[PDB]
Structure formats: structure tokens, C-alpha cells
Design a protein around this nucleic acid. Structure first.
Length: 36
DNA sequence: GATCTGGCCTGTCTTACACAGTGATGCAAATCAAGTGTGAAGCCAGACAAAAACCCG
């Protein structure tokens, strides 16, 4: 486990509520994680 | 005529030299640690009908 893995496991429901479908969801997650 | 001597011939060590090994490093690269999230396949229950080869009348 790493910081990115923890952030993903913590904010996956965010992308879930945002878009159902997870290419674009994971892309946006990685983008916002690299931004923050 | 009787030895004395310089120059090849050739079987000798003798000696350097590259290679094969042992071990360990050490970077380039393929794969995986988990996160969902679909998304396309594989097979099975329900009962009903088409190609291909060998033997008999």
C-alpha cells in the first residue's frame, strides 16, 4: 500500500457518484491526485 | 697429407599469450502491488430441425 493507493481507496466512491463508467473515472482520479 | 674452424640443420626446451572459468555487479525492461468499472467472451436448461459417409434392396 502507498499514498496513491490509499487516496484511490478513499476517493473511489467520489468517482462512483460522479460517473458510472472505469477508464475515465480512474483517469480523473489520477489527474486530481497529481494536481493535489 | 693432417687436423682446425665458420656456417647451416634440426630436435630441443622456454616462454609469452589469449581464453575460460569462478564469483559479483548493474542498468534496461517487463511485470505486478491494490482500486473499481464494465465488457466481451465461455458454457447450460427449455424442445425443434440440416450436411456427410457406408450398407442394403
Amino acid at each position: 500500500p502507498s499514498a496513491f493507493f490509499l487516496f484511490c481507496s478513499e476517493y473511489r466512491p467520489k468517482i462512483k457518484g460522479e460517473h458510472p463508467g472505469i477508464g475515465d473515472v480512474a483517469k480523473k482520479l489520477g489527474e486530481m491526485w497529481n494536481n493535489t
